[PDB]
């Protein structure tokens, strides 16, 4: 008379999330940490090999040390750019290095630099195709395959650079390889390019690969390790706070049709918000992703059509008086939601001088609504086309909701315009959103539909063009490619109104969705080995 997608219970118990009594939770560490930051800062500014700095830049970044070295990352690339005239689209053709040019291409464009597609030009035969000689330089080769991910629609060279590269990386790995760890790094990124590969939940493996590295420096290896632990401690801190909240809602028992995953739900933010200083944003998001998970279960599992429409609309008119009029589980949910935006908007009014409640409120509302059109089809047995779906999709998934919540806390000051521009669900918001969706849709879907939910994109795909599932998979993979391109531009600006740290969260959501839904089982639903990176980046300390 009610359904329930049978999600099992959170593999992490209270007493654990409460025990979690860290260790590098105290200063002496960071003083030490912050004391190497300096040696490394200048082993950095001391080096002269530009390609070396590039190499060390890329490394510091794959290990989450990126927070210290920020304006260094900038002085260095600023320079290389200029002292290599990377600006000009018109090429000089020093035949340049494939490896050094791709590496620098990559970090420059990432660090927002204008670096013409035509840079890789001097590596083409006169047939205009890529140079089949290059076929052997695979350090470089692997690295060009890695700069491609930084393109935009209308950048064939890049688009075919990725093609050539993959094929050779491919074979090289396919045969016994001209190494062993090469064989793996090639596959590691042939599984996910660094550009779509989210840092923080991954630093560890890179940390020890650098450890096993020769050239390798310790001031580094070790600075890398300490900081690593200095934040983990901290995550744990934000962790409890969010838990502490979860527990109070007692949805855990009072509204349990709902998957419980406060941890998974806080773990996303471990990637979505990489700049350590935005803690409250991560805490607040532990709870926001949570309220989402529950409101979505209410929509695609539990609640009925009457029940939903009613909920939907009271939300719409944020009618806390009629609070008691909807079923009982929709009261406690609704009030906990009104309690969350109100306590959250208090902290923003409190610490930034602004009444943000009309917005986080909207954020919720729209999210609610779109979850509604998804019931309706499904309940009303309407099955939509790929576009109808893809259109609700990028919002029902909650991307803007979480992403708009995040803006008020990563950015330090905004104007009403910056704000309204955002709430268009500014393009940025829609593209990182699409990725989380397309990736999420590509992960779930089978069960989304099976234990109830409207068809997903692969699904509407295969009905649409009437295709094989593979066909849909490929299609939807492509879609992701395409919006990443869309996103690349936007993030590297549009005279984007969005500040630094914010847009990066936007980009990082699309990134974390790709880890989270890379082998499957939701943002935790049934957790494959998403359970490893999790206990590894949240609980288990480093060597």
């Amino acid at each position: 008379m009610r359904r329930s997608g049978n999600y099992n219970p959170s593999r992490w118990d209270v007493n654990f999330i409460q025990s979690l009594l860290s260790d590098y939770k105290e200063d002496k560490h960071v003083i030490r940490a912050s004391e190497l930051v300096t040696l490394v800062k200048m082993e950095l500014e001391k080096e002269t090999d530009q390609i070396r700095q590039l190499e060390l830049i890329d490394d510091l970044q794959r290990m989450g040390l990126s927070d210290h070295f920020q304006n260094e990352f900038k002085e260095i690339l600023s320079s290389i750019y200029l002292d290599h005239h990377y600006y000009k689209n018109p090429f000089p053709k020093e035949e340049r290095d494939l490896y050094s040019t791709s590496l620098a291409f990559r970090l420059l464009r990432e660090h927002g630099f204008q670096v013409a597609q035509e840079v890789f030009d001097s590596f083409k035969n006169e047939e205009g195709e890529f140079k089949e000689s290059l076929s052997d330089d695979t350090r470089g080769l692997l690295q060009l395959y890695e700069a491609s991910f930084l393109l935009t629609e209308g950048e064939t060279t890049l688009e075919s650079a990725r093609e050539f590269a993959t094929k050779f990386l491919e074979e090289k790995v396919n045969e016994g390889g001209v190494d062993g760890d090469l064989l793996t790094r090639i596959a590691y990124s042939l599984d996910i390019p660094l550009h779509w590969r989210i840092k923080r939940p991954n630093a560890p493996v890179w940390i020890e690969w650098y450890r096993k590295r020769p050239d390798m420096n310790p001031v580094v290896l070790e600075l890398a390790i300490l900081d690593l632990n200095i934040v983990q401690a901290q995550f744990q801190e934000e962790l409890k706070e969010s838990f502490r909240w979860w527990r109070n809602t007692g949805f855990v028992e009072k509204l349990p049709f709902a998957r419980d995953r406060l941890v998974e739900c806080y773990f996303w933010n471990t990637g979505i918000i990489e700049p350590r200083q935005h803690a409250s944003a991560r805490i607040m998001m532990g709870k926001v992703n949570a309220l989402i998970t529950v409101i979505d279960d209410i929509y695609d599992v539990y609640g009925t059509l009457e029940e939903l429409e009613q909920f939907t609309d009271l939300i719409r008119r944020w009618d806390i008086n009629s609070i008691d009029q909807l079923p009982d589980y929709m009261q406690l949910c609704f009030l906990a939601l009104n309690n969350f935006v109100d306590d959250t908007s208090y902290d923003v009014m409190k610490e930034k001088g602004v009444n943000v409640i009309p917005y986080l409120r909207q954020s919720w509302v729209d999210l609610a609504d779109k979850y509604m059109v998804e019931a309706r089809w499904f309940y009303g047995g309407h099955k939509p086309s790929l576009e109808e779906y893809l259109e609700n999709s990028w919002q029902s998934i909650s991307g803007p909701c979480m992403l708009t919540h995040i803006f008020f806390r990563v950015t330090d000051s905004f104007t009403k315009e910056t704000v309204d521009s955002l709430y268009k669900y500014h393009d940025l918001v829609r593209w990182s959103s699409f990725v989380l969706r397309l990736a999420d849709d590509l992960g779930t879907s089978v069960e989304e539909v099976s234990r109830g939910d409207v068809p997903k994109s692969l699904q509407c795909y295969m009905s649409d063009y009437n295709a094989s599932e593979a066909e849909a998979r490929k299609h939807v993979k492509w879609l992701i490619a395409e919006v990443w391109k869309k996103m690349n531009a936007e993030r590297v600006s549009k005279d984007s109104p969005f500040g630094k740290d914010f847009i990066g969260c936007a980009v990082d959501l699309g990134r974390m969705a790709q880890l989270m839904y890379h082998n499957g089982d939701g943002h935790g639903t049934q957790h494959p080995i998403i359970h490893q990176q999790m206990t590894r980046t949240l609980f288990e300390p480093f060597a």
Copy 2:
């Protein structure tokens, strides 16, 4: 060009407040405690002498164990009640004993046994006046003086008994040789009768008095002291919590002007809610008393007349949309105030299954508006007549807000109907409110109005009858006298719709009120020794 209270900061430090944490939170602790109940109970129930059985319920109470010995106290008095026949309309001749009759009359009436006034008749003489021959029995005379506080206009005999024992008790005290330290127990209740002595912030002394008591029982003394500590700890826990809330409002820095006295604001609740199990009622109440303190400041000190007519109103219409147009300091106060009722209400909705938000809201609205009426008399010339003031005061002293807020936490179940009876503001609520007030006015007054405010009773009485200050202080003391009677009556009442505990806190706020405002200003600022009382029932352990 905004007045200021001329206030000092919480004498207690956050890092202290935050730290303090005591060893007795360790279970085995109360276990010991709970092995002694079993035997002090044992000693109790096995007692034979009924006058020793009463002297024990009385200590078990004043010493704080009143909680684990409940269903015992009942049997021992239903037994003395019935046996000694106190439920009869007559019986005397000239034969009961003074100390036992008074002692047993006090406990039975306290416990709501009906024990007619005429009992003390048997100690009267020819003229229908207390036999002077009694001028001697002082353990007796003291016992009587003290049971005269359990009367009800009706009761002249008790009113005329209050006199007897007081005069000769003064004698006995002016004579340093009647004993010496009894001379101090005598004057102790001569200052505040047991009937109007909140227990909890008073146990310590009783404890060591019982301790030096010759006849004393050490397992009692033992159970006694261990409990004191096991509950002072739970206080501290609650303390931190309501603190933790305080720190968040950030009123300290943002709504400076109002006094910061949160441990005081909690200490209050150390008397109002004596049954240990109401832990939340006391946490929630730390936060409530705080908002009251503040909102009160906002009215009698910072806020302007337009700025208050405004606050007053929006809260009355209660809406966080036009929250946008109050002064920034009134957006923060109104929003956090809303958040609290919303939070508190989510708790009651969580646990008790009901939406109490439209009532706590209403508690807050009426409190506000009475703060307004006074604010208009201030700004708007008017010096009310001693009765118009008295009719607003008992409401403007927060009183009902405090209590109504409380009813919901201490009452497992209820009915719209008894809620409503409550919310018209039952007499039960009114009388205790009254005590808190008059005790306040009697105490506060001075800087209250000199440093700007409306005339408190002391003052309207003087103006009114053009009287010296004694008279008015006397009148008020006499008034406290009367509402207390009206209070005995309602607490033992007929069909009070309130439960033991609740009606309990109603008379207990009047008691706590007579403590804080007994040495002047109490609450927070002057609190003379009022600090050694807190420092002692919140931080400083026993033996």
